[PDB]
Design a protein around this motif. Structure first.
Motif, PDB file in Angstrom:
ATOM      1  N   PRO A 192     -77.751 -15.142  68.850  1.00 25.43           N
ATOM      2  CA  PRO A 192     -77.495 -16.472  68.299  1.00 25.43           C
ATOM      3  C   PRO A 192     -76.001 -16.757  68.339  1.00 25.43           C
ATOM      4  CG  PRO A 192     -79.059 -15.312  66.949  1.00 25.43           C
ATOM      5  CD  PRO A 192     -78.432 -14.291  67.861  1.00 25.43           C
ATOM      6  N   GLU A 193     -75.634 -18.006  68.600  1.00 27.61           N
ATOM      7  CA  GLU A 193     -74.223 -18.354  68.624  1.00 27.61           C
ATOM      8  C   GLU A 193     -73.956 -19.574  67.751  1.00 27.61           C
ATOM      9  OE1 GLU A 193     -74.004 -21.170  72.687  1.00 27.61           O
ATOM     10  OE2 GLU A 193     -72.818 -19.332  72.522  1.00 27.61           O
ATOM     11  N   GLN A 209     -65.501 -19.743  64.906  1.00 23.12           N
ATOM     12  CA  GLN A 209     -65.356 -20.652  66.036  1.00 23.12           C
ATOM     13  C   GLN A 209     -66.668 -20.844  66.785  1.00 23.12           C
ATOM     14  OE1 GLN A 209     -61.867 -19.516  68.545  1.00 23.12           O
ATOM     15  NE2 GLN A 209     -61.245 -18.289  66.769  1.00 23.12           N
ATOM     16  N   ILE A 210     -66.828 -22.014  67.395  1.00 23.78           N
ATOM     17  CA  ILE A 210     -68.027 -22.294  68.165  1.00 23.78           C
ATOM     18  C   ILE A 210     -68.047 -21.297  69.319  1.00 23.78           C
ATOM     19  CG2 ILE A 210     -69.205 -23.946  69.623  1.00 23.78           C
ATOM     20  CD1 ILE A 210     -67.908 -26.186  68.002  1.00 23.78           C
ATOM     21  N   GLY A 211     -69.187 -20.649  69.529  1.00 19.19           N
ATOM     22  CA  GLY A 211     -69.277 -19.672  70.594  1.00 19.19           C
ATOM     23  C   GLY A 211     -69.317 -18.257  70.047  1.00 19.19           C
ATOM     24  N   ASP A 212     -68.920 -18.076  68.790  1.00 17.63           N
ATOM     25  CA  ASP A 212     -68.973 -16.743  68.201  1.00 17.63           C
ATOM     26  C   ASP A 212     -70.445 -16.355  68.087  1.00 17.63           C
ATOM     27  OD1 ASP A 212     -66.237 -16.730  67.997  1.00 17.63           O
ATOM     28  OD2 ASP A 212     -66.184 -17.221  65.854  1.00 17.63           O
ATOM     29  N   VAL A 213     -70.739 -15.066  68.222  1.00 20.70           N
ATOM     30  CA  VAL A 213     -72.120 -14.622  68.161  1.00 20.70           C
ATOM     31  C   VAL A 213     -72.470 -13.942  66.854  1.00 20.70           C
ATOM     32  CG1 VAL A 213     -72.382 -14.435  70.653  1.00 20.70           C
ATOM     33  CG2 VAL A 213     -71.481 -12.488  69.365  1.00 20.70           C
ATOM     34  N   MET A 214     -73.764 -13.848  66.579  1.00 17.84           N
ATOM     35  CA  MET A 214     -74.229 -13.214  65.358  1.00 17.84           C
ATOM     36  C   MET A 214     -75.468 -12.398  65.665  1.00 17.84           C
ATOM     37  SD  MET A 214     -74.068 -16.823  63.076  1.00 17.84           S
ATOM     38  CE  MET A 214     -74.746 -17.769  64.614  1.00 17.84           C
ATOM     39  N   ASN A 215     -75.760 -11.426  64.813  1.00 18.12           N
ATOM     40  CA  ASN A 215     -76.961 -10.621  64.976  1.00 18.12           C
ATOM     41  C   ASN A 215     -77.471 -10.391  63.562  1.00 18.12           C
ATOM     42  OD1 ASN A 215     -75.292  -8.421  63.949  1.00 18.12           O
ATOM     43  ND2 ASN A 215     -76.595  -6.969  65.066  1.00 18.12           N
ATOM     44  N   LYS A 216     -78.752 -10.076  63.429  1.00 20.33           N
ATOM     45  CA  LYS A 216     -79.338  -9.846  62.117  1.00 20.33           C
ATOM     46  C   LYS A 216     -78.842  -8.544  61.509  1.00 20.33           C
ATOM     47  CE  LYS A 216     -83.741 -10.458  62.054  1.00 20.33           C
ATOM     48  NZ  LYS A 216     -83.841 -11.508  60.997  1.00 20.33           N
ATOM     49  N   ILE A 217     -78.505  -8.588  60.226  1.00 18.99           N
ATOM     50  CA  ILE A 217     -78.038  -7.402  59.521  1.00 18.99           C
ATOM     51  C   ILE A 217     -79.259  -6.609  59.046  1.00 18.99           C
ATOM     52  CG2 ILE A 217     -76.828  -6.578  57.474  1.00 18.99           C
ATOM     53  CD1 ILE A 217     -74.904  -8.917  57.755  1.00 18.99           C
ATOM     54  N   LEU A 218     -79.251  -5.302  59.285  1.00 20.09           N
ATOM     55  CA  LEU A 218     -80.368  -4.449  58.886  1.00 20.09           C
ATOM     56  C   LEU A 218     -80.023  -3.564  57.698  1.00 20.09           C
ATOM     57  CD1 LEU A 218     -81.811  -3.126  62.285  1.00 20.09           C
ATOM     58  CD2 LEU A 218     -82.395  -5.223  61.057  1.00 20.09           C
ATOM     59  N   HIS A 219     -81.043  -3.218  56.917  1.00 20.41           N
ATOM     60  CA  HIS A 219     -80.865  -2.366  55.748  1.00 20.41           C
ATOM     61  C   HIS A 219     -81.055  -0.923  56.171  1.00 20.41           C
ATOM     62  CE1 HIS A 219     -82.289  -5.841  52.890  1.00 20.41           C
ATOM     63  NE2 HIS A 219     -81.436  -6.245  53.814  1.00 20.41           N
ATOM     64  N   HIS A 220     -82.246  -0.638  56.685  1.00 22.25           N
ATOM     65  CA  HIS A 220     -82.595   0.699  57.136  1.00 22.25           C
ATOM     66  C   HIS A 220     -81.680   1.229  58.234  1.00 22.25           C
ATOM     67  CE1 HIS A 220     -84.553  -2.370  59.453  1.00 22.25           C
ATOM     68  NE2 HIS A 220     -84.947  -1.522  60.385  1.00 22.25           N
ATOM     69  N   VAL A 261     -72.991 -23.058  66.949  1.00 24.68           N
ATOM     70  CA  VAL A 261     -72.985 -24.288  67.741  1.00 24.68           C
ATOM     71  C   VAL A 261     -72.164 -25.366  67.041  1.00 24.68           C
ATOM     72  CG1 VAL A 261     -75.271 -23.814  68.703  1.00 24.68           C
ATOM     73  CG2 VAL A 261     -75.049 -25.251  66.668  1.00 24.68           C
ATOM     74  N   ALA A 262     -71.968 -25.197  65.740  1.00 31.11           N
ATOM     75  CA  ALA A 262     -71.191 -26.150  64.962  1.00 31.11           C
ATOM     76  C   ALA A 262     -70.812 -25.559  63.612  1.00 31.11           C
ATOM     77  CB  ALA A 262     -71.983 -27.452  64.762  1.00 31.11           C
ATOM     78  N   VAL A 263     -69.667 -25.998  63.098  1.00 28.18           N
ATOM     79  CA  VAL A 263     -69.184 -25.541  61.806  1.00 28.18           C
ATOM     80  C   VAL A 263     -68.677 -26.741  61.025  1.00 28.18           C
ATOM     81  CG1 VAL A 263     -67.605 -24.046  60.573  1.00 28.18           C
ATOM     82  CG2 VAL A 263     -68.445 -23.389  62.828  1.00 28.18           C
ATOM     83  N   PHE A 264     -69.134 -26.857  59.787  1.00 26.09           N
ATOM     84  CA  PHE A 264     -68.731 -27.943  58.907  1.00 26.09           C
ATOM     85  C   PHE A 264     -68.457 -27.314  57.547  1.00 26.09           C
ATOM     86  CE2 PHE A 264     -71.332 -30.140  62.117  1.00 26.09           C
ATOM     87  CZ  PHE A 264     -70.462 -31.165  62.478  1.00 26.09           C
ATOM     88  N   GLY A 265     -67.178 -27.177  57.226  1.00 24.66           N
ATOM     89  CA  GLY A 265     -66.812 -26.571  55.965  1.00 24.66           C
ATOM     90  C   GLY A 265     -67.285 -25.131  55.921  1.00 24.66           C
ATOM     91  N   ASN A 266     -68.118 -24.819  54.938  1.00 21.93           N
ATOM     92  CA  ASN A 266     -68.622 -23.463  54.765  1.00 21.93           C
ATOM     93  C   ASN A 266     -69.988 -23.278  55.412  1.00 21.93           C
ATOM     94  OD1 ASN A 266     -67.944 -20.900  53.301  1.00 21.93           O
ATOM     95  ND2 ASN A 266     -69.940 -21.290  52.354  1.00 21.93           N
ATOM     96  N   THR A 267     -70.423 -24.282  56.167  1.00 24.06           N
ATOM     97  CA  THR A 267     -71.730 -24.259  56.807  1.00 24.06           C
ATOM     98  C   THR A 267     -71.719 -24.167  58.329  1.00 24.06           C
ATOM     99  OG1 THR A 267     -72.781 -25.479  54.988  1.00 24.06           O
ATOM    100  CG2 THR A 267     -73.863 -25.566  57.133  1.00 24.06           C
ATOM    101  N   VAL A 268     -72.460 -23.198  58.850  1.00 21.65           N
ATOM    102  CA  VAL A 268     -72.562 -22.999  60.292  1.00 21.65           C
ATOM    103  C   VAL A 268     -73.959 -23.364  60.804  1.00 21.65           C
ATOM    104  CG1 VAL A 268     -72.505 -21.332  62.158  1.00 21.65           C
ATOM    105  CG2 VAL A 268     -70.863 -21.165  60.286  1.00 21.65           C
ATOM    106  N   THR A 269     -74.026 -23.909  62.013  1.00 24.00           N
ATOM    107  CA  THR A 269     -75.305 -24.267  62.618  1.00 24.00           C
ATOM    108  C   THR A 269     -75.541 -23.392  63.848  1.00 24.00           C
ATOM    109  OG1 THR A 269     -75.054 -26.573  61.931  1.00 24.00           O
ATOM    110  CG2 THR A 269     -76.648 -26.111  63.694  1.00 24.00           C
ATOM    111  N   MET A 270     -76.747 -22.845  63.983  1.00 22.18           N
ATOM    112  CA  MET A 270     -77.095 -22.037  65.149  1.00 22.18           C
ATOM    113  C   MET A 270     -78.370 -22.640  65.726  1.00 22.18           C
ATOM    114  SD  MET A 270     -78.721 -18.248  63.803  1.00 22.18           S
ATOM    115  CE  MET A 270     -80.305 -18.214  62.678  1.00 22.18           C
ATOM    116  N   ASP A 271     -78.551 -22.518  67.043  1.00 28.29           N
ATOM    117  CA  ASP A 271     -79.715 -23.097  67.709  1.00 28.29           C
ATOM    118  C   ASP A 271     -80.995 -22.274  67.755  1.00 28.29           C
ATOM    119  OD1 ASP A 271     -78.757 -25.677  68.174  1.00 28.29           O
ATOM    120  OD2 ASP A 271     -77.887 -25.175  70.128  1.00 28.29           O
ATOM    121  N   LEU A 272     -81.308 -21.630  66.635  1.00 27.10           N
ATOM    122  CA  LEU A 272     -82.538 -20.862  66.488  1.00 27.10           C
ATOM    123  C   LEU A 272     -83.099 -21.315  65.140  1.00 27.10           C
ATOM    124  CD1 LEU A 272     -80.635 -19.042  68.319  1.00 27.10           C
ATOM    125  CD2 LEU A 272     -82.209 -17.173  67.775  1.00 27.10           C
TER     126      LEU A 272
END
Length: 356
Positions: A269-270, A345-356, A272-283
């Protein structure tokens, strides 16, 4: 490939065991993201017991560990390390959000082969079927619709643009290369017509615009209609026919080949937009995103390795996010460290954080 990660662990009875747990915390992040085996981490820990600046390992996906910093912070041990990982060709990214696929409209290479039944639109209709197949029966895909896309005239840059506009990580294109038929006589003159269906399919990476894989399909089935009959490839009647059923078989095989070829790849996921403390991703909901989901933000950066030349490294940000709102195909996330919001920044990537 290099990964820069951080870890933290509360100091209870020993600063040394705290250090080992922070190191493990960090390693997990890198190993998980890289696609390597998190289960193999335990086998490395004993070797980290002796405090060093750098470590080297054999017979392991983790090749090198460079400790940049290790400090005591508010009753905890914090570490920052650089890890060089080479995931096994057997690695598989697990519990990933679904991948978005765009289905290009399948073209008929030689229109004249569609004369019988006047099925000139069979390519378009098949794409509709493939689209439906992926959306409601696949395990790892979300189809965002059909659209004209040629593999005859293909340019990586054009592909990259199409994918970006539809937020797809993959585009499937195709061309029907054979719809010819031969007439035969079993009991009566010209009583049987066997028609071909040859399809060359290509799957392109939306990021590079380069083909990830390709496959050709060829089948033959009886054309269950008089040669003079006009057939509507949009109708349920056609799809229930023997020839239609064969095409539906190909549709399922395409879905299976896609799953076998892409199921283990990472869904990244990347922003796609940032508004204040809120980020939007296309998933979104359709991709398996859930309101509680926690994600880690990553940045790509450059550094000078032990050689003296610039290398790229996947760097873990201090920023983590929480999904706040989910929509069908997109989602909003709140930044957990608002003071750092401006670094996203727009274009930065993310991945799900795991516990186990």
């Amino acid at each position: 490939s290099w990964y820069e990660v951080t870890g933290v662990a509360t100091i209870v009875s020993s600063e040394e065991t705290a250090r080992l747990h922070a190191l493990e915390d960090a390693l997990f992040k890198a190993v998980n993201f890289s696609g390597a085996d998190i289960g193999s981490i335990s086998n490395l820990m004993p070797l980290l017991e002796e405090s060093r600046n750098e470590y080297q390992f054999t017979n392991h996906e983790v090749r090198y560990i460079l400790v940049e910093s290790e400090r005591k912070r508010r009753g905890k041990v914090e570490v920052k390390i650089r890890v060089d990982i080479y995931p096994s060709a057997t690695g598989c990214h697990t519990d990933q959000y679904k991948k978005t696929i765009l289905v290009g409209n399948i073209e008929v290479a030689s229109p004249q082969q569609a004369v019988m039944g006047q099925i000139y639109q069979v390519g378009d209709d098949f794409s509709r079927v493939v689209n439906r197949q992926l959306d409601q029966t696949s395990r790892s895909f979300v189809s965002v619709g059909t659209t004209d896309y040629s593999i005859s005239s293909n340019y990586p840059a054009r592909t990259q643009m199409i994918a970006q506009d539809n937020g797809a990580q993959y585009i499937i294109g195709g061309v029907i290369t054979d719809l010819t038929a031969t007439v035969e006589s079993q009991l009566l003159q010209d009583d049987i017509i066997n028609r071909q269906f040859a399809l060359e399919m290509k799957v392109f990476d939306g990021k590079t615009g380069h083909e990830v894989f390709n496959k050709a399909y060829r089948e033959v089935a009886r054309w269950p209609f008089a040669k003079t009959s006009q057939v509507d490839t949009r109708s349920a009647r056609f799809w229930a026919s023997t020839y239609g059923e064969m095409m539906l078989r190909v549709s399922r095989n395409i879905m299976l080949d896609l799953e076998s070829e892409l199921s283990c790849k990472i869904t990244l996921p990347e922003v796609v937009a940032v508004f204040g403390n809120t980020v939007t991703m296309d998933l979104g909901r359709m991709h398996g995103v859930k309101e509680g989901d926690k994600l880690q933000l990553w940045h790509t950066a450059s550094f000078i390795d032990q050689n003296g030349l610039p290398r790229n490294k996947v760097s873990q940000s201090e920023i983590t996010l929480t999904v706040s709102r989910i929509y069908e195909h997109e989602a909003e996330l709140t930044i957990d460290q608002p003071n750092l919001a401006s670094s996203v920044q727009i274009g930065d990537v993310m991945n799900k954080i795991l516990h186990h």
